[PDB]
Design a binder for these strands. Structure first.
Length: 113
RNA sequence: GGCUGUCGUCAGCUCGUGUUGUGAAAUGUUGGGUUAAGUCCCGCAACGAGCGCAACCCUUAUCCUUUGUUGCCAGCGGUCC
């Protein structure tokens, strides 16, 4: 009756030992996420996303998977929100100058082409 | 000084910002390939930028437009041809 969270996790042994309280139990050579522990973060995530949207905060969609990287563009422009695609290599959030230059000049030259 | 040859029209040389490092410094500037090329894709803590490479300059090849002389003679005339 809950939302998504009827999965079973993806790991055989390569577990970070900081997932001490978030694993429901290991079995059949696969570690299982605490599906039942999916209740709270829904509530807070909604609360702070609503709070940031009160003054219309922006959120970045990121992903580098063969199926999910496009599967976030839909979630971006459905709510007309910021996103990236495959292959986002670091050095722009900290390196603001080069990314600002790149985006403005490159889209302006696309308009100018 | 100026000017010149030189490796060598070889392809490398560095910088801004980031990041990492107490730090000198490293990164960038890496593998696969690829190009004539640090030429470019792919994965990459780096993105970019500068001189670099190409191209922009000159010449050549096809065609067209304009002008037709001292240049040409397809058509016409006879020709001191």
């Amino acid at each position: 009756m809950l939302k998504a969270g009827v999965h079973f996790g993806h790991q055989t042994r390569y577990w970070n030992p900081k997932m001490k309280p978030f694993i429901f139990g290991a079995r059949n050579k696969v570690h299982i996420i605490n599906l039942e522990k999916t209740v709270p973060m829904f509530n807070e995530a909604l609360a702070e996303l609503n709070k940031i949207a009160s003054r219309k905060g922006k959120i970045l969609f990121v992903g580098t998977k063969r199926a999910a990287s496009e599967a976030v563009k839909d979630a971006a422009l459905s709510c007309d929100q910021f996103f990236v695609n495959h292959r986002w290599l670091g050095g722009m959030l900290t390196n603001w100058k080069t990314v600002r230059q790149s985006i403005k000049r490159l889209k302006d030259l696309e308009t100018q082409s």
